[PDB]
Amino acid sequence: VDKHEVRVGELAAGQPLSLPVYRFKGKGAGPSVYIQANVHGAEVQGNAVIYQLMKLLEHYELLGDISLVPLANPLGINQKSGEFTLGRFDPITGVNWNREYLDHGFNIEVWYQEHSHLDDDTLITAFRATLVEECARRLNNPWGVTTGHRLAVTLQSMAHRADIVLDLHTGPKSCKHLYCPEYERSAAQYFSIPYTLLIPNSFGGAMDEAAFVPWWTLAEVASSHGRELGVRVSALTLELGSQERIDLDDALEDAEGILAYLSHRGVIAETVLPKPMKRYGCFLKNYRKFHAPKAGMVEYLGKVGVPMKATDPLVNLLRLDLYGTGEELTVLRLPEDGVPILHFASASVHQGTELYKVMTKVFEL
Amino acid sequence: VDKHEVRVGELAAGQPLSLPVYRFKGKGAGPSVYIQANVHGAEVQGNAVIYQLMKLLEHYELLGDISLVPLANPLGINQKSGEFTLGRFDPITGVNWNREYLDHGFNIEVWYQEHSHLDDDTLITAFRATLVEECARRLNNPWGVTTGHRLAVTLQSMAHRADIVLDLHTGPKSCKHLYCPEYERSAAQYFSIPYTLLIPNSFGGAMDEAAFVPWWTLAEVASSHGRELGVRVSALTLELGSQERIDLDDALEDAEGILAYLSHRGVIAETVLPKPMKRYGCFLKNYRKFHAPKAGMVEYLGKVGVPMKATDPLVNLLRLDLYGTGEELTVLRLPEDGVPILHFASASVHQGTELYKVMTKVFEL
Amino acid sequence: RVDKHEVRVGELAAGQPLSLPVYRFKGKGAGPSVYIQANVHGAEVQGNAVIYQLMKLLEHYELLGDISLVPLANPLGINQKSGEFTLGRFDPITGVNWNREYLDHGFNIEVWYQEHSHLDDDTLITAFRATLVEECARRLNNPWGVTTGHRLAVTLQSMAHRADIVLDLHTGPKSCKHLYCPEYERSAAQYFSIPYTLLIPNSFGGAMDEAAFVPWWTLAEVASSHGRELGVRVSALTLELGSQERIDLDDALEDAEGILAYLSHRGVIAETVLPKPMKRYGCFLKNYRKFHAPKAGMVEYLGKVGVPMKATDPLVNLLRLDLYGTGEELTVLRLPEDGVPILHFASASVHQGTELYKVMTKVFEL
Amino acid sequence: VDKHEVRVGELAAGQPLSLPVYRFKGKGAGPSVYIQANVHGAEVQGNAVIYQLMKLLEHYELLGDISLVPLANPLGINQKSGEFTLGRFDPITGVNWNREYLDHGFNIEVWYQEHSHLDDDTLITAFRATLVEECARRLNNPWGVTTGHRLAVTLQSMAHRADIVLDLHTGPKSCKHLYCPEYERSAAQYFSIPYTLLIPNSFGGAMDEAAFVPWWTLAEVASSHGRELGVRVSALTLELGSQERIDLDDALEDAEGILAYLSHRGVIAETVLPKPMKRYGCFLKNYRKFHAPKAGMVEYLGKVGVPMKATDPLVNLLRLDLYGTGEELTVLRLPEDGVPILHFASASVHQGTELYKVMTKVFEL
């Protein structure tokens, strides 16, 4: 396993901020893969998944290149506030690190017309080069870029080089879930993840969108001019359970599912079949946020990853300040049938604190 | 002066979160005004400006109603982290409190068509009622709304009721500046603020935009159908110097400038002239952010509100870890001529930390 | 039945007062008085659930002594968030632990004793209590003022000083149920439903229990040095009821049932409530050890809280993706001595020196 | 100037925590010196002081060794919360980095009796070796030590090796002041510092105390057996103005004061005279903390380092929530005549927030 380090920033006291990049060289015509974990500092299980995946890959026949970037945001990973990693956003500005990726601005209609005389492979190579160069340009600005933008664009440049991008995250108190763009709903069949969110061709600041939107858009533009190029990049986001947790056995299960997808895509020569299990989904627009309608102390009743019906108890809300009044213990209920995916990591909420995220209008994939 | 209290939230231990609303009734046909301060918790000087304005208003003849909401975000105001106020964003999620306002989704073209028969005043009354009603609809949701969204929508509902909205902020280490929509560039000459950013018809989550975007879009639609309605609301954001400070004399000067605008608008009967001083403008697109190109300890040389040249030293960057190498003390310079408006409030930066914001292509108003 | 009053403990910059709800059940008898508080550490919310369940139960018992309960005892800490966690343990401005702000009475107890020794036991005790209550008032009446945390602690303390029994309800981070019990009342552990007890000495270290018992224990010592037996006339125990950032009403019922056994034992309630049968272990406080990370990294916790282990047992796996391909990629850290891990760090990522576990060593059955 | 790095810790993502140690070798018999800065993360001016000192030291004739340790707490230096450095205490535990030093437990009376047959220099050498070894023993513990304790003891071990220890800090919003032990009141005359706190032989967790307490106790014990050994180490703490600030020219003034002390002690051969200026002192017991008696917004009126009377206004307390009542704006005053040294860095306080520290019963040195 070839390893190098990639510089992503620098701290006030002088210390460089760098990432370890592990590379497995493929011997064949299989697709290239880029995997990263822990952009969100508290979401550490992704590192254990990378560890297990690399241990497994050491016994497979790699047909395509694989690059793996654990510990992808040291500034967030190393940031504590109390006994909790404050790792989700820049502590100075509040900007979510996974909202700092680069939306390629250029006109794809024009880019396509200017390259439409090239054959598919040549055109694809040129498009990839244009994205990599756009990242370089962005970082070359004399006014500079934000701390998180430098990190994200640096990761993005590496991701753009691959045919397949897997971004490993975790939820707070959460079940395993997956984000797939609508064009590759089938990907969910190979991972070992029970709930999938199908997402549209829209850039919203995150790595997966940053990676797929240019290619999905190029595919549509090409087809609109009678050329069926196809979407040439896969980019998926795996939300592997809960944050602030390392569970090596569970990480192995996640890694086994990833291998099934890698086998399916021809990255590895061996046939690795998907885990037989039920897989459900919902379209992103039906993924709902449930906010505390009143403040108070919270006992979570809705178990993550378990379907619930409209009006079922989601939490008990306890109010010691209201003892004997009639409202010291109340039940907050789920508005619509759905599956609670994740809940707030703390037991005390203000009015409006996000208590849960719930997939509604869920279907079997 | 009538005092009222408006609830905006509730804390886990049981206390309600509420705001003081001071209302002066006008005796006449003057425009109505809504003024708030301290939505960003550290930006406390706005409270002193409200204090001084109310003290002054007691000696003027009010022709229009004025509502004043100091201490507009107690959750942010009361949030300390070390010896400073962590007041800019929700500490749980990182979302800027001034990015939680509501962009009205309804079709203004259709709305206009359905009300085009009304005269100006009734059409304005109808539109205003619609905006107020949409805020109410937003807060009534079984899935709830964020802590910051409840606060923002509550403030916005009050703001929508006024003809003039003044949002009082401060910068970090900053000179006095003003955000003014392009449709009322004339406003800038009445306030006592040397630098003004002229901003376009675009919603970006903030109060001023929330208040003016619907009316500006309405004006455009009306005009397209041959009706020159005009933009019937004014909404301006005053960035009154630096955060984490109360300066009552300085606040009086700010209040006097506000009074000049209110006099100009016929809110008060008396003639209060603008303070004589030079005033400059800049289109929003030319307001640039300068990020640290390297980490280190900063001596700030560019003074806020003082024009400078690209060749001038902006900061000295000290690196004790590089003593003896030639890199221990380096000078940073801005890529372009301009006027630094504000700079970072700390002397320690990581690579990418936003060091200054700078108005470029400045012109005299 | 229950009377509620509010007690002011501070004020916020924007104007809102900081206040506590104080619930009181009046006793109809000669039983001892009891003062119970919870959630002085903001993240330690289970104590509210314990107070809730206890009050629901108490409504059906016969009270011989007064019981005052103070849930939500620190709204400034309780309401303080940082990320998806309550930054509730210390003043966020200064770092000072809210449970290190209590008042150590400085007056000379030997001299106070000599000046009141002619009094009978009950009159001497009443006088001592009055002195403690007055000393708290004097502390808060200072033109230079006092810290935010000291004002809170001293307000709680003055209430606590009025009772015969003080129960401070806490939680650990990821923790089993444990109890702090002063050496002079080792028997108390036999009544609660708590498997592990730390026996603590006569020493003031800034906390409520110490603040409550040190003056009385010292007074008993002074009286005994003169051949007069007064006894330690106040009981002050700290219950660490599981993990923080959690409300578990069923588990809180169990805790409340144990507290009731102690109250029956002390004659606060008329009814017989016998202790839950279970093995109960203890160790002296000096044998309660802090295990710090020897190296930074990602941690998988192997030592389960409340489960005895040996030195040869794995405490955690330490995972280092930055060291992949070397022997340091994944290592096992082990405890240096046999003991019982009580609690561990609430996060999976540690720096060198981060406190990984607290472990009772030299444990014995009580 | 020789430079080496000293390991003090390690972060979660794997990065080492190290300090740059700059060493100037002495040639002769002059006392040795240990200088450190920025143990408290926000107190960055000490770095500028060290930078100036090192530039100056390259031209002086050194008779004793000098070690300088700027950037002495990278974990605290690099920690941000909003636009400020949360650098005073461990963000996990709240423990002040400058309360983590080691109080040597060993019986000095016994130690002295076991070495009383040794002459002064042999005894001094042995006592120093004992202190250094106790630090090593502390760090060699299978149960480990806290993050802050490892740092503090590492710094302390280096400090113990020197004859003169200078710990460079800053206050929040503060004038320049000095902590000087009662046994060397004469040292204060040399520094360029107007206000000095004379401190007793008491260990409170801080570097200076950690460095001097053993030697001061040893002097007491020696003297009690008819041997006037004297206190063989000098340990002073300079609070060099305000935090979150780099001012190079002002740092130069501080460095020159330091060099006057060093010249006075014979560390450098050249005569560097102290700056003429009035110098005052105060015994530590008379340094008082003034806390907010009520919450609110604060305008600081008491200027740091300027004597005041109990009848003078210290702050205006502004309460917008109490407008229209006598409590809308009130004046808080100093209970006793004194010199305000430092005040709170923010303008919004809760009841009990420490507003000022004030030296009372001040005398000219």
In chain D, which residues have their Cβ closer than 8 Å to the Cβ of A80?
A: 91-92
Smallest Cβ–Cβ distance between D13 and the set A13, A74, A81 belongs to A74
In chain B, which residues have their Cβ closer than 8 Å to the Cβ of C78?
A: 12-13
Asked if D138 reaches chain C (Cβ–Cβ under 8 Å), the answer is no
Q: Are D327 and C15 in contact (CB under 8 A)?
A: no
Measured distance CA(A57)–CA(D61) in Å, rounded: 63
The subunits that touch chain C, with at least 3 C-beta pairs less than 8 Å apart, are A, B, D
Among C residues 214-233, those touching chain D with beta carbons less than 8 Å apart: none
Q: Is D55 exposed, middle or buried (0-12, 13-18, 19+ CB in 10 A)?
A: middle
Q: Are B237 and B176 in contact (CB under 8 A)?
A: no
Q: Looking at chain C, how many residues does it have?
A: 366
Measured distance CA(B323)–CA(D69) in Å, rounded: 12
Smallest Cβ–Cβ distance between B288 and the set A9, A143, A148 belongs to A143
Tokens of C273: 């409530």
What are the residues whose beta carbons fall under 8 Å from the beta carbon of B35, sequence distance 6 or more? B50, B53, B66, B67, B68, B69, B165, B166, B168, B258
Angle between helices C109-116 and C208-225 (to 10 degrees): 60
Measured distance CA(D141)–CA(B69) in Å, rounded: 58
Please give the single-letter amino acid code of residue C217: W
**SS3 category, A95:** coil
CA distance, residue D238 to nearest chain C CA (Å): 21
Q: Are A297 and A348 in contact (CB under 8 A)?
A: yes
In chain A, which residues have their Cβ closer than 8 Å to the Cβ of D83?
A: 92
Q: Are D323 and B20 in contact (CB under 8 A)?
A: yes
**What's the CA angle centered on C295, arms C289 and C298, to 5 degrees?**
100
Q: C148-151 — which CB contacts under 8 Å span 24+ positions?
A: C148/C10, C148/C76, C148/C91, C148/C93, C148/D350, C148/D351, C148/D352, C148/D353, C149/C91, C149/C96, C149/C97, C149/C98, C149/C100, C149/C101, C149/D352, C150/C101, C150/C103, C150/D352, C151/C9, C151/C10, C151/D351, C151/D352
**SS3 category, A351:** coil
CB distance A71–C330 less than 8 Å? no
Query: What b/e sequence results for D91-121 when a residue is b if at least 16 CB atoms lie within 10 Å of its CB, and e otherwise?
Result: bbbbbbbbebbbebeeebeebbeebeeeeee
What are the residues whose beta carbons fall under 8 Å from the beta carbon of B116, sequence distance 6 or more? B123, B225, B227
CB distance D297–C13 less than 8 Å? yes
- Nearest residue of chain C to residue B82 (CA atoms): C93
**How many CB pairs below 8 A link A and B?**
127
CA torsion angle D224 D225 D228 D231 (round to 10): -60
Measured distance CA(C261)–CA(C275) in Å, rounded: 5
**How many CB pairs below 8 A link B and C?**
42
Sign of the CA dihedral with D93 first, then D94, D98, and D103 last: negative
CA distance, residue B146 to nearest chain D CA (Å): 21
Beta bridge partners of B3: B22
Tokens of A194: 């029970």
CA distance, residue C332 to nearest chain D CA (Å): 14
What is the spatial order of strands in the sheet that D339-343 belongs to? Answer: D173-174, D339-343, D354-359, D287-291
Q: Is C106 exposed, middle or buried (0-12, 13-18, 19+ CB in 10 A)?
A: exposed
End-to-end C-alpha distance for chain D, whole angstroms:
36
Measured distance CA(A41)–CA(C349) in Å, rounded: 9
CA distances, D222 to each of B260, D123, D215 (Å): 77, 11, 10
CA distance, residue A131 to nearest chain B CA (Å): 22
| Helix-then-strand count for chain C, H and E | 7, 20
Asked if B347 reaches chain D (Cβ–Cβ under 8 Å), the answer is yes
Among C residues 80-99, those touching chain A with beta carbons less than 8 Å apart: 81-89
Tokens 């009538």 belong to B2
Strands C85-86 and C81-82: antiparallel
Tokens of D224: 């009690």
Measured distance CA(A263)–CA(A272) in Å, rounded: 6
Question: Residue A340: which H helix or E strand, with range?
Answer: strand A338-343
Q: With CA atoms as reference, report the closest residue to B38 among B345, B213, B245, B178.
A: B245
CA torsion angle D26 D28 D31 D36 (round to 10): 0
DSSP state of A96: B
Measured distance CA(C4)–CA(A324) in Å, rounded: 10
Measured distance CA(B100)–CA(B88) in Å, rounded: 12
Q: D131-134 — which CB contacts under 8 Å span 24+ positions?
A: D131/D104, D131/D160, D131/D214, D132/D157, D132/D160, D132/D161, D134/D102, D134/D104, D134/D106
Measured distance CA(B232)–CA(B216) in Å, rounded: 8
Tokens of B81: 């982290």
Q: How many CB atoms lie within 10 A of CB D5?
A: 11
**SS3 category, C169:** strand
* Structural domains for chain D: 1-286+363-365 (3.40.630.10), 287-360 (2.40.50.100)
Strands C177-182 and C349-350: unpaired
Smallest Cβ–Cβ distance between B12 and the set C12, C79, C82 belongs to C79
CA distance, residue D42 to nearest chain B CA (Å): 8
DSSP string, A282-305: EEGGGEEEEE-SS-EEEEE-SPTT
Smallest Cβ–Cβ distance between B92 and the set C12, C83, C92 belongs to C83
Phi-psi region of C337 (alpha: psi -120 to 50; beta: other; left: phi over 0): beta
CB distance B14–A147 less than 8 Å? no
CB distance A92–D82 less than 8 Å? yes
DSSP state of B339: E
3-state secondary structure labels for all residues of chain D: CEEEEEEEEECCCCCEEEEEEEEECCCCCCCCEEEEECCCCCCCHHHHHHHHHHHHHCCCCECCCEEEECCCCHHHHCCECCCCECCCECCCCCCEHHHCCCCCCCCHHHHHHHHCCCCHHHHHHHHHHHHHHHHHHHHCCCCCCCHHHHHHHHHHHHHHCCCEEEEEEEECEECCEEEEEHHHHHHHHCCCCCEEEEECCCCCCCHHHHHHHHHHHHHHHHHHCCCCCCCCCEEEEEEEEECCCCCHHHHHHHHHHHHHHHHHCCCECCCCCCCCCCCEEEEHHHEEEEECCCCEEEEECCCCCCCECCCCEEEEEECHHHCCCHHHEEEEECCCCEEEEEECCCCEECCCCEEEEEECCCEEC
CB distance D81–B85 less than 8 Å? no
Backbone angles phi, psi at C26, to 5 degrees: -80, 130
Q: Entry resolution in angstroms?
A: 1.8
Measured distance CA(D162)–CA(D151) in Å, rounded: 18
The subunits that touch chain B, with at least 3 C-beta pairs less than 8 Å apart, are A, C, D
Best of D22, D23, D346, D357 to mutate (most B CBs within 10 Å, chain B): D346
Question: Residue C318: which H helix or E strand, with range?
Answer: strand C314-319
DSSP state of C245: S
Measured distance CA(C170)–CA(C177) in Å, rounded: 10
Phi-psi region of A14 (alpha: psi -120 to 50; beta: other; left: phi over 0): left
Asked if C13 reaches chain B (Cβ–Cβ under 8 Å), the answer is yes
Tokens of A101: 């990726």
Tokens of A261: 């997808």
Best of A11, A51, A69, A244 to mutate (most D CBs within 10 Å, chain D): A11
CB distance C247–A316 less than 8 Å? yes
Question: Residue B330: which H helix or E strand, with range?
Answer: strand B329-333
DSSP state of C309: B
End-to-end C-alpha distance for chain C, whole angstroms:
37
**SS3 category, C256:** helix
Q: How many CB atoms lie within 10 A of CB A114?
A: 11
Q: Are C245 and A345 in contact (CB under 8 A)?
A: yes
Phi-psi region of C242 (alpha: psi -120 to 50; beta: other; left: phi over 0): left
What is the spatial order of strands in the sheet that B329-333 belongs to? Answer: B329-333, B313-318, B296-300, B348-349
CB distance D92–A83 less than 8 Å? yes
Angle between helices C121-140 and C208-225 (to 10 degrees): 140
Q: How many CB atoms lie within 10 A of CB B324?
A: 11
Measured distance CA(A269)–CA(C64) in Å, rounded: 79
Tokens of A11: 């701290």
Tokens 């700030």 belong to B300
Tokens of A198: 């199908």
Measured distance CA(D254)–CA(D250) in Å, rounded: 7
Tokens of D115: 């070495």
- Nearest residue of chain A to residue B92 (CA atoms): A353
CB distance D15–A78 less than 8 Å? yes
**SS3 category, C14:** coil
Angle between helices D120-139 and D147-160 (to 10 degrees): 160
In chain D, which residues have their Cβ closer than 8 Å to the Cβ of C352?
A: 9-10, 17, 147, 150
DSSP state of B55: H
What are the residues whose beta carbons fall under 8 Å from the beta carbon of D117, sequence distance 6 or more? none
Tokens of D320: 């917008």
Q: Are A80 and A86 in contact (CB under 8 A)?
A: yes
What is the spatial order of strands in the sheet that C17-25 belongs to? Answer: C2-11, C17-25, C67-70, C34-38, C165-170, C235-241, C177-182, C196-200, C281-284, C364-365
**SS3 category, A177:** strand
Strands D339-343 and B234-242: unpaired
Phi-psi region of D319 (alpha: psi -120 to 50; beta: other; left: phi over 0): beta
Among B residues 280-309, those touching chain D with beta carbons less than 8 Å apart: 297-299
Tokens of B285: 């697109």
Best of D348, D353, D357 to mutate (most B CBs within 10 Å, chain B): D348
Q: Is C326 exposed, middle or buried (0-12, 13-18, 19+ CB in 10 A)?
A: exposed
